Design a protein around this ligand. Structure first.
Ligand code: HEM
Ligand code: HEM
Ligand code: BOG
Ligand code: BOG
Ligand code: HBI
Ligand code: HBI
Lengths: 413, 413
């Protein structure tokens, strides 16, 4: 019945039974179709909706310490009637709160899941215009940032009705820097955002040609054309990069935003789909220090830092790259701490996740996990997660990927 | 038809068609059953054998630049007759050589595959006793070691007949250190070899209770009980660990063997199975520096080195572990070079593999690859392999895992 997984570090064994509740190896693929919930042009067929809704209501009430069968039966009936008379249904605030946390709890690629129960939920299901979306997002950014003392939060916009009136954030993240192709051929800023930066420009946004220009929110409300909105600067908290030992580090003129917020995912719960539900947590050092600053396709500062440290940047076997990326990682952590901005190093995060995984098997017999995503981009086997065998599966509620909005959108004018 | 994979580093796209020729996500599991070819007590059914044999003969002749249809048809006929009259068949030396290289070429977890064509093949298919196995292995170790100038080689023992007369090396590797549970409760040597060390002791071997005691070869010939054989010390080349800057590093008294040799895998080719075919290449630095020296379940020297460097070994966020493992990696590389022993750092190995993958798609439309196994244990995203999307599939010829011999063996006395 159960699948056994071994922790080669501690030798411990765990029994997975949770995978039964799930829905060439292509595990290396970035955004596979199996994890992508696309568009629709017709309401969810009732045959599919009702069963999923019942399943979720049962899950909701089954999660209480003190069972409430009286209210449980009443809810099952009311949901049925609502679907019967309207073709869909509305979740209660508590059900939604429950759904967002469980969906987080069910995110296989998330290493910060020990925090699953601490989540502020902003109910924006009554939203209707792009301007209103913008206001909600600003309130979210402000709450979440909290002047460095980062707080996890999520904002839930209206659920998909027929698929023709979807609320969508065209941005990948709430805060992200622009990338510009310069006249001299060089790339300025975030090379990974070239295409999207151009889109913002095509829509009206004015390019400032800097290394760290915060991109605007491209908001789609009620299925209509996306509108551009500059994020008010006071809301964007940044951290200037300094090294605790190398004074020349600040001469690099690097910085990064403090708020990590996924803006384009879809929340599936009880047959319902929320195409717009931006959420955030706090940063894990290696995200900035390794991916943002060291990927060749991003800011690519590795060679510059190595040369500044006076390393043999011309001989790979010298391991100058290993020495460089570490000082950069140290810079990021040191900077976020000096400026009182929440952040967690990868070692502490890894240990934190192991503890979580342990709690999850103890509590529900499993923990969906994506090894490829969970193992940090540096010092892999130095972290306990590397030696932990994992099972990857899709539960419900769940946070799905969506097809790029500009690829399936039908323009008004 | 084809599957597309993206290299997020260079942006390059590749089309995989090779996967068509192959035979919850459990990709994180160490040794899955899908990659394990177990024991048998009866010959391979002819229905299965002939087709696999024909397929391989076609592959063999189809690999020549100058087609030789005259000899090809003759071989197809002869193999058929041999299976018809004997129940199995013998590969020609050239076919075996071809099979060992292709099987290597088909190893998804191997990062040194650009070297696939440089492989010495020792034909020991006429072997019959444990003593003879021992002699072949010694010759292999000696050839492969070549006083530091490591050469890749493989020794092919007799193929499985009915499964009752299998040739098997009970060892995981040809050269490996013993692990001892000491009287005071502490573990000496390689903690990962405790059980196997005890087995050698039970079979007659004398424990020397040192930190680096080379284990004996436990050889099983013609299906009979395994016999113990001490590896002649002159044949075991070792490297004393020194750091280019820290004089105190040699005070750690560390060392490692120079020869990485997998001893327990099974070679499948054209329906045939060779349960004993030890092979070797040369070491990749991180194997010793990171796994051997830094895994908690192995030599676990990380904290000692950190404290010697005067680091904040009591504060994870200081990233002392990242600084320590790097100096150890540097020590290993520096030591192997100073003592003129072949070795490759992980960065160079990664670039080497990317070039290989490129050559493989260009040549045959694919390259079976296991991301989890290919990405180095440190500085993951600093290497190009991390950003390469991969497809994992089983081709033929292939090197399979086998069930632990002590678990399925029937003792004589
Ligand atoms: C409290 C702090 C948190 C930390 C430190 C954390 C950290 C991370 C990291 C490092 C990743 C991988 C990012 C990447 O490389 O793509 C990730 C992914 C993810 N996290 Fe968390 N997380 C936290 C909170 C949250 C919250 C509040 C939610 C949702 C309510 C969440 C949902 C997810 C999801 C769905 C992914 C996958 C995103 C994708 O595949 O692109 N996380 N998180
Ligand atoms: C020329 C130098 C070579 C290098 C540097 C190299 C390196 C490696 C490394 C680092 C691994 C992973 C080891 C582990 O962590 O378990 C590996 C695995 C493997 N290599 Fe290579 N290799 C080389 C030659 C060979 C040769 C000559 C063969 C076979 C003829 C081969 C067959 C394999 C196989 C089958 C595996 C998988 C073993 C397992 O899953 O336990 N390699 N190699
Ligand atoms: C048509 C669908 C019928 C579903 C039957 C649901 C019966 C109620 O289900 C009950 O809910 C309680 C929570 O209050 C749980 O504690 C109980 O374990 C569970 O059996
Ligand atoms: C019963 C199985 C019949 C198999 C038919 C094999 C026909 C020969 O096969 C030929 O072998 C040549 C190599 O010499 C290749 O170059 C040719 O492309 C290939 O068609
Ligand atoms: C190709 C491969 O899927 C890609 O490089 C991966 N990206 C990521 C990863 N892990 C995380 N956390 N985030 C990533 O973006 N692992 C590897
Ligand atoms: C649990 C997980 O499968 C295990 O930690 C893995 N071991 C290894 C690995 N990769 C290599 N090359 N060798 C290993 O032993 N990746 C991860």
């Amino acid at each position: 019945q159960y699948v056994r997984i071994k922790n080669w570090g501690s030798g411990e064994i765990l029994h997975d039974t949770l995978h039964h509740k799930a829905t060439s190896c292509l595990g290396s693929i970035m955004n596979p179709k199996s994890l992508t919930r696309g568009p629709r042009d017709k309401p969810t067929p009732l045959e599919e909706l009702l069963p999923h809704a019942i399943e979720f209501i049962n899950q909701y009430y089954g999660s209480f310490k003190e069972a409430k069968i009286e209210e449980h039966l009443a809810r099952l009936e009311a949901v049925t009637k609502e679907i019967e008379t309207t073709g869909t249904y509305q979740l209660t605030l508590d059900e939604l709160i429950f759904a967002t946390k469980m969906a987080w709890r069910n995110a296989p690629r998330c290493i910060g899941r020990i925090q699953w129960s601490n989540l502020q939920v902003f109910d924006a299901r009554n939203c209707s215009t792009a301007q209103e979306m913008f206001q909600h997002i600003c309130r979210h950014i402000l709450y979440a940032t909290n002047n460095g003392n980062i707080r996890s939060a999520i904002t839930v916009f209206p659920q998909r009705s027929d698929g023709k009136h979807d609320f969508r954030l065209w941005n990948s993240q709430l805060i992200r820097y622009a990338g510009y192709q310069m006249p001299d051929g060089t790339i300025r800023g975030d090379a990974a955002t070239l295409e999207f930066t151009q889109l913002c420009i095509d829509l009206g946004w004015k390019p400032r040609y800097g290394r760290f220009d915060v991109l605007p929110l491209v908001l789609q409300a009620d299925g209509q054309d996306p509108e551009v909105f500059e994020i008010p600067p006071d809301l964007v908290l940044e951290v200037t990069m300094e090294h605790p030992k190398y004074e020349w580090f600040q001469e690099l003129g690097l910085k990064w935003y403090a708020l990590p917020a996924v803006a384009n995912m879809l929340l599936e719960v009880g047959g319902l789909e929320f195409p717009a539900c931006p959420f955030n947590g706090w940063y894990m050092g290696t995200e900035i220090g390794v991916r943002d600053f060291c990927d060749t396709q991003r800011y690519n500062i590795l060679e510059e830092v190595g040369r500044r440290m006076g390393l043999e940047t011309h001989t790979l076997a010298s391991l100058w790259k290993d020495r460089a990326v570490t000082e950069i990682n140290v810079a990021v952590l040191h900077s976020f701490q000096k400026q009182n901005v929440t952040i967690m190093d990868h070692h502490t995060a890894s240990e934190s996740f192991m503890k979580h995984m342990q709690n999850e098997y103890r509590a529900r017999g499993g923990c969906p996990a994506d090894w490829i995503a969970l193992v940090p981009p540096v010092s892999g086997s130095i972290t306990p997660v590397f030696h932990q065998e994992m099972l990857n599966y899709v539960l419900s509620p769940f946070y799905y990927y969506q097809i790029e909005p500009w690829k399936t959108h039908i323009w008004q004018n």
